[PDB]
């Protein structure tokens, strides 16, 4: 039995795709997260699940693997023939394999393809378009590995409650993308209020958390609907690098964004209207330049931190600019005076 299941720990941990909900037996413990860890979509995007959900899955599975009552059973993470659920569930167990079983992304993906099962559906973006850029499960696992490699997260210290608190629009709609360096959020409004259920936040709402977390600088990329004075008077620096919603940034805007961030001491809070497309795109440019993430790796990492980031042509833009951005990184490092 378990025909076509994917083995992750010899005779102990498996991943299965099942038409119907199975029943745990005296030998096999079955569990699914398809209805527990649910992606919140903007449009037709369906994943990857965010970093807090990865964390919650890993906690859940580690507990099952330490349970005495389950110690003599095979543990089987199962998902359905809903390919959008299945892709997220495969991403979750693959991410567990990378983070906790010390597998490479390629080894984890090999196990995911080991059984007799169809391929995994790639993740799409949050735009109205028909899908044009395939973000694969392997891409996401590569992004997890790179984020781990460069210390962009640490599940020994990750605070999932706080992540899931501040991601909500009533609490500021923000996520850290690079700890101590980049915070992404939706653009503040002139007056704090609640308009048609949807709460709006003024610049001053953010002053406490920013000050407490060494946020020194705000970069705005969308239309002005508040005075930059409101931040600068509070001691923050503020920069305007506007480009059209849904567009790709010019060479000039990229160079200026990078100049700002490279000459900035503390953390930088970046926003557009939603804090997803324009914001994710420019942050990715910096991370590609200075950490040599590939386009797929950074699109994965930023979406795992902040779902819906990097939209439509911005995806292909990052792929088309990768070689250039890596070269700009080499040139940047060739001028340093360190050691």
């Amino acid at each position: 039995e378990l025909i076509g299941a994917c083995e992750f720990m010899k005779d102990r941990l498996y991943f299965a795709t099942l038409r119907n909900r199975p029943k745990s037996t005296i030998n096999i413990h079955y569990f699914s997260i398809d209805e527990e860890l649910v992606y919140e979509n903007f449009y037709a995007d369906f994943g990857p699940l965010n970093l807090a959900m990865v964390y919650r899955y890993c906690c859940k599975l580690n507990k099952k693997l330490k349970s005495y009552s389950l110690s003599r059973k095979k543990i089987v993470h199962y998902t359905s023939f809903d390919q959008r659920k299945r892709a997220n569930a495969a991403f979750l167990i693959g991410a567990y394999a990378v983070i906790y079983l010390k597998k490479t992304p390629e080894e984890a993906y090999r196990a995911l393809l080991s059984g007799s099962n169809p391929p995994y559906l790639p993740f799409r973006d949050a735009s109205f378009g028909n899908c044009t850029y395939n973000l694969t499960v392997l891409d996401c696992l590569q992004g997890i590995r790179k984020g781990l490699q460069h210390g962009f997260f640490d599940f020994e210290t990750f605070d999932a409650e706080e992540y899931e608190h501040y991601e909500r629009v009533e609490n500021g709609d923000f996520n850290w993308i690079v700890p101590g360096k980049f915070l992404a959020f939706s653009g503040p409004h002139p007056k704090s209020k609640i308009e048609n259920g949807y709460p709006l936040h003024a610049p001053e709402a953010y002053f406490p958390y920013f000050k407490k977390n060494n946020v020194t600088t705000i970069v705005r990329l969308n239309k002005k609907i508040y005075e930059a004075k409101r931040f600068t008077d509070a001691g923050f620096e503020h920069y305007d690098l506007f480009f059209i919603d849904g567009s790709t940034p010019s060479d000039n805007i990229v160079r200026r964004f990078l100049n700002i961030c490279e000459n900035t001491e503390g953390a930088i809070a970046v926003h557009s209207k939603a804090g997803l497309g324009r914001t994710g795109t420019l942050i990715a440019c910096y991370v590609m330049k200075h950490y040599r993430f590939t386009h797929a790796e950074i699109i994965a990492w930023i979406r795992i931190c902040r779902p819906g980031s990097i939209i439509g042509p911005q995806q292909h833009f990052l792929k088309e600019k990768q070689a250039s951005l890596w070269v700009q990184g080499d040139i940047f490092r060739s001028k340093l005076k360190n050691r």
Binding site: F42, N222, A274, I311
Partner: peptide
């Protein structure tokens, strides 16, 4: 093309 940011969501709304």
């Amino acid at each position: 093309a940011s969501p709304r």
